[PDB]
Design a protein around this ligand. Sequence first.
Ligand SMILES: [Ca+2]
Ligand SMILES: [Ca+2]
Ligand SMILES: [Cl-]
Ligand SMILES: [Cl-]
Ligand SMILES: [Cl-]
Ligand SMILES: [Cl-]
Ligand SMILES: [Cl-]
Ligand SMILES: [Cl-]
Lengths: 151, 151
Amino acid sequence: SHMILKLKHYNEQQSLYSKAIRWDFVIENTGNSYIDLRNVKVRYYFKDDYKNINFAVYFYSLGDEKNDVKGKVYNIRQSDSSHKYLEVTFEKGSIPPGDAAWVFGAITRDDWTEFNQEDDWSFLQGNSTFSYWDKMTVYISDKLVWGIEPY
Amino acid sequence: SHMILKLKHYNEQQSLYSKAIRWDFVIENTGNSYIDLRNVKVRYYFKDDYKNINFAVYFYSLGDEKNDVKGKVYNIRQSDSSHKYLEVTFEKGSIPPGDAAWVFGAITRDDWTEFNQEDDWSFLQGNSTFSYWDKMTVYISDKLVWGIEPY
Ligand SMILES: [Ca+2]
Ligand SMILES: [Ca+2]
Ligand SMILES: [Cl-]
Ligand SMILES: [Cl-]
Ligand SMILES: [Cl-]
Ligand SMILES: [Cl-]
Ligand SMILES: [Cl-]
Ligand SMILES: [Cl-]
């Protein structure tokens, strides 16, 4: 009958126009068993029409940034092309009860032109550190366990 | 790109064993247009195996408690019988931007025997007034717009 995880987010780029979108999050384990991140997806929703987005992981507290944390951008439907999410997944990682996974990184357009973050569902302004944020979502084996999908 | 509603809940019965479960909630309108409650469902998740549950509305800030606010209990699946939700719906009601709908009431077993709230997903303890509560859900035309379903 208990939730066993919560998510916090902090976005270092709070200007509306930015070359990088920061999806940094912390998944907190609030239950009594380990959480297997191999079954966990996290989504950052954004609106943008540039096809070639690059994904960079700057920090992963539970493993190797290059090898263990993966990112891919998906369209929400065939139409319209601009409504997307980045989905972050893990090849390895286990969150101890009472602990948290810290995962920091960015996405950028391959041509280094700027995003307009103003219309991005997951965009968080006005805070100065990691805060619970219900506009990014978390799934465990494809069940939605945290957050609100765009509507 | 914005959420337009949030939910707060307060449960006046915080004893684990209780003859009444209080589902009281406030839906806040955080956007710029009216919210039509005719398209809104709110769910309180609980585990209980008594078939005949009665629903009482004590306060509805936007209309008539008897006629305008409706409640029905549903099973989450055929199996297991005990995992349920109360769904609250509205025949009438429109939340002004910047305002909130207050909706207080209870469910009871028709035989007046006690619930055990300890295993109820939506059960909230340790608070002294209405607080944002992400273990009750809200839907607008069947899209989930607030909260986390049991998992
Ligand atoms: Ca955008
Ligand atoms: Ca129960
Ligand atoms: Cl909980
Ligand atoms: Cl916070
Ligand atoms: Cl949604
Ligand atoms: Cl928002
Ligand atoms: Cl609160
Ligand atoms: Cl769920």
